[PDB]
């Protein structure tokens, strides 16, 4: 499967200027477009090399939709702050995530249209693409309004049409890189934490896509109860890094094995320490 996603952040700055409006577009784990309100000239910009092929008519239409959405969030921020009885001075954040997922056939798998206010769930379009789930009392008011107005039909028409159509097109433009997988380059490092125990760290480096499974499994433990797992992090070259660590008694390190699952690996990696 493949995914097209837009991450929209609107932050009001009372007394400092208009709300900052930022929209970032991702195809799978690769970012291809950006709109930032604080740029000297705010317009949609390519953040992937394969997007520099797009003609002005693409960029002008995208920028206009971004500028249109900016007014939407400027109103919606004001509408929210007044409903919640919040202080006018307070800065507040509206977040929106929308996009589509396509299956093996490259036909739509799921459509997303979700909102968060001040970092909490507000309203989200359900998987049916026809009904809404409200997080709080305020969202229940948004839901009744959007039900009568028929907003779900407006968003579903895009998710079912332009979103999937442009996902397949983006996959065509960046095909030689987007469809590639980079299997993780994995190794085990041995650091003797104490005089009684040692920390074993399993590394997975330079892998794309971002999804990965790292487990240390002792004697066949499916996973480990006391294991430090860091968040998957970007290397900055389009590949990602992750590591998993366990603290084990000295002399029993060879019982522990690290297992790596990735889209690049048809078979899982099994890693052991060897000094």
């Amino acid at each position: 499967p493949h995914s097209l996603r837009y991450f929209v952040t609107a932050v009001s700055r009372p007394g400092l200027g208009e709300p900052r409006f930022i929209a970032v577009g991702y195809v799978d784990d690769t970012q291809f477009v950006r709109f930032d309100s604080d740029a000297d000239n705010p317009r949609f910009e390519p953040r992937a090399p394969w997007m520099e092929q797009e003609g002005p008519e693409y960029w002008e239409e995208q920028t206009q939709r971004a500028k249109s959405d900016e007014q939407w969030f400027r109103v919606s921020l004001r509408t929210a702050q007044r409903y919640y009885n919040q202080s006018k001075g307070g800065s507040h954040t509206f977040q929106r995530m929308f996009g589509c997922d396509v299956g093996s056939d490259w036909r739509l798998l799921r459509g997303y249209h979700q909102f968060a206010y001040d970092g909490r769930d507000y309203i989200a379009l359900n998987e049916d693409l026809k009904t809404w789930t409200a997080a709080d009392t305020a969202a229940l008011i948004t839901r009744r309004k959007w039900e009568q107005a028929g907003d779900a039909e407006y968003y579903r028409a895009y998710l079912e049409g332009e979103c999937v159509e442009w996902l397949r097109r983006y996959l065509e433009l960046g095909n030689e890189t987007l469809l590639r997988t980079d299997s993780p380059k994995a190794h085990v490092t041995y650091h003797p934490r104490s005089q009684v125990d040692v920390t074993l760290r399993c590394w997975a480096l330079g892998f794309y896509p971002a999804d990965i499974t790292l487990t240390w499994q002792l004697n066949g433990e499916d996973l480990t109860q006391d294991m430090e797992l860091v968040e998957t992090r970007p290397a900055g070259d389009g590949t990602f890094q992750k590591w998993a660590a366990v603290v084990v008694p000295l002399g029993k390190e060879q019982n522990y094995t690290c297992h790596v699952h990735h889209k690049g690996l048809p078979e899982p990696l099994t890693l052991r320490w060897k000094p």
Binding site: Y6, A23, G25, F44, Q62, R65, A66, S68, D69, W72, F73, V75, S76, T79, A80, Y83, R96, F98, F115, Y122, I123, A138, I141, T142, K145, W146, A149, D151, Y154, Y155, Y158, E162, C163
Partner: peptide
């Protein structure tokens, strides 16, 4: 991209 239609309230 798709812009919003109805406002939250």
């Amino acid at each position: 991209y798709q812009s919003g239609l109805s406002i939250v309230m």
